[PDB]
Amino acid sequence: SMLGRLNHVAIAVPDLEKAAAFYKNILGAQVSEAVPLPEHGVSVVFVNLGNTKMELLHPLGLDSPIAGFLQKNKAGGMHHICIEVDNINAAVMDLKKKKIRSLSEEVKIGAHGKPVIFLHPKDCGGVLVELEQA
Amino acid sequence: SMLGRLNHVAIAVPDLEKAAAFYKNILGAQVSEAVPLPEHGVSVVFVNLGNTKMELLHPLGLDSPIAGFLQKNKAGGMHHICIEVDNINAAVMDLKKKKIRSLSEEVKIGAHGKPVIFLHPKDCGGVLVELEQA
Lengths: 134, 134
Ligand SMILES: [Co+2]
Ligand SMILES: [Co+2]
What we know:
The structure is a homodimer. Chain A is an alpha+beta fold. Chain A has a single domain, classed as 2,3-Dihydroxybiphenyl 1,2-Dioxygenase, domain 1 (Roll), CATH 3.10.180.10. Chain A has 3 helices and 9 strands; from the N terminus they run βαββββαβαβββ. The first copy, chain A, has helices spanning 16-26, 67-72, 88-97; strands at residues 3-12, 30-31, 35-37, 42-48, 53-59, 77-85, 108-109, 115-119, 129-133. Chain A starts with a strand and ends with a strand. The relative contact order of chain A is 0.21. The A-B interface holds A 1-6, 9, 11-15, 18-19, 21-23, 26-29, 49-52, 54, 56, 75-78, 81, 83, 95, 98, 100, 121, 123-127 and B 2-6, 9, 11-15, 18-19, 21-23, 26-30, 49-52, 54, 56, 75-78, 81, 83, 95, 98, 100, 121, 123-127, 129. The site of one cobalt (II) ion has 7 residues of chain A, from strand 1 and strand 6. Chains A, B: One of its GO terms (molecular function) is metal ion binding. Chains A, B: Residues 5-134 form the VOC domain. Chains A, B: One of its GO terms (biological process) is short-chain fatty acid catabolic process. Chains A, B: Co(2+) binds at residues 8, 80, 130.
């Protein structure tokens, strides 16, 4: 099938250090060191749950894509899910053909250095969905 | 005691049939029939992504535990993540000993027929977390 695995659940957090330490030292998760991603305006910590990852995100620089989310959601919150696709270009053409209003039109290189597209919550799906080339 | 896999990401949706059909017929996901869970005050559709599932949730009756979420988030939204643990009782005692204010006291039987506990976003972790016995 075109649609694949859940690659990550992304959580925006107001304190990346504290969030990472909670998963690591309270819950006993496998947690990475923080990685700055300046191109993407965030810092990330990866929580490896074995089957998938949680990405803990915090703004990096004054123009972060998640800065506005953290003003609304001061305690942090679930920000998006990311599901893999076998072929992102075939997937974009298909979704364009289906004429869905949530499609974000332009394929960009995402935080993993692979092409992605975002579907906003505009067709009953209920969540921001990042689709990433597998 | 030891933390395990992500069992599900739960999404609250204002229209369960519309959300299910989006995943199935727009994204090409494997999607269950809607299952009412009256004891838990919701109806669920399971989206099987192979590595984990999405549980799409809609209120069933008046005092649904997600009814209040759906008033705040009219388009619906990510409601919780569920992570497995090998021993729910051990985890509850460990968490009670760590004195974390996110801990929700009562072990209940969840929709999967397994004991669960919830931790709220009160300790820098960013999301509602359900822990469920493996
Ligand atoms: Co992402
Ligand atoms: Co759940």
